[PDB]
Structure 1
Amino acid sequence: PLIVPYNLPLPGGVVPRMLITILGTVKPNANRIALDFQRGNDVAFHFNPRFNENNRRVIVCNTKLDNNWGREERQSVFPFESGKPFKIQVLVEPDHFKVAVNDAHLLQYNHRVKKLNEISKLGISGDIDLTSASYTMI
């Protein structure tokens, strides 16, 4: 497995048609996972599965600018399962990140950070065994 937290450079930033694939296994009794598409210190897109928020499971998405979090977008559809292998695919589209988990569409996140070519790192953290992190163009 790979080290966690893991930093995946995204050379020259992201661009529409870029596909990022994360393979991993959720730890048993996991509490949280996070993917962070970063533009310097800013987080353009924070994708944050929470396994126990008030005994509910929820995915929280947000953007961090100048060290401040913005308005959260929440998705109650929750495809992750403690102890089980997953695939997260993030397709960059002109106006949003499109996220699918285990080949099922999950959510879209409108670009708040609009300088896409400056979003040049993906951080992966939380309660997973990380198997692979890669990107390609489709």
Structure 2
Amino acid sequence: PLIVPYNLPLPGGVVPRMLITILGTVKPNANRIALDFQRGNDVAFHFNPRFNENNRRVIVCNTKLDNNWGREERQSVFPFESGKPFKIQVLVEPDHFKVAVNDAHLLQYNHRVKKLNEISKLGISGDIDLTSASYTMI
């Protein structure tokens, strides 16, 4: 029952072996969800499930620099379901964010923004009921 859009500060930025866990439930008839790992106004890693992009469900990932979106990376494996509870785990590895949903590996996103210690907040937005958002070291 956290309020969305939600800002999760990441004190001191991200570092390899930091694991972010998001628990929530997708709203009925959802259209979109987004996670935004932010470096100030820049978005180092945008993770964006789209439930109806031309009648397809797709995960779009990208980076926003100086207000410009870059090259999209797309994944048609789509583990989210309207009305149902999910877990997203984002593990920071040296060279990528590694994302698992409901305990199944989903995708990796190579670091475009390389000042990891400056990626010091995570925004969570879109068509979910947000249960919890936290981090720990593994």
TM-score normalised by L of structure 2 = 1.00
Deviations 1:23-73 (A, max 9, x none): 000000000000000000000000000000000000000000000000000
Aligned counterpart, 1:41: 41
Q: Tell me how far apart the structure 1 counterparts of residues 7 and 79 of structure 2 sit (CA, whole Å).
A: 24
Aligned counterpart, 1:24: 24
Residue 123 of structure 1 aligns to a residue in which SS?
strand
The two structures, once aligned, show a CA RMSD in angstroms of 0.2
Q: Tell me how far apart the structure 2 counterparts of residues 118 and 129 of structure 1 sit (CA, whole Å).
A: 28
Residue 79 of structure 2 aligns to a residue in which SS?
coil
Q: Tell me how far apart the structure 2 counterparts of residues 75 and 117 of structure 1 sit (CA, whole Å).
A: 27
Q: Tell me how far apart the structure 2 counterparts of residues 67 and 78 of structure 1 sit (CA, whole Å).
A: 27
Residue 113 of structure 1 aligns to a residue in which SS?
coil
Q: Tell me how far apart the structure 1 counterparts of residues 41 and 33 of structure 2 sit (CA, whole Å).
A: 19
**Residue segments in structure 1 that go unaligned for 5+ positions in a row:** none
Residue 16 of structure 1 aligns to a residue in which SS?
coil
Q: Tell me how far apart the structure 1 counterparts of residues 76 and 15 of structure 2 sit (CA, whole Å).
A: 28
Q: Tell me how far apart the structure 1 counterparts of residues 77 and 101 of structure 2 sit (CA, whole Å).
A: 11
Structure 1 ranges of 4+ moved more than 2 A: none
TM-score normalised by L of structure 1 = 1.00
**Residue segments in structure 2 that go unaligned for 5+ positions in a row:** none
Q: Tell me how far apart the structure 1 counterparts of residues 135 and 16 of structure 2 sit (CA, whole Å).
A: 12
Residues matched between the structures, number: 138
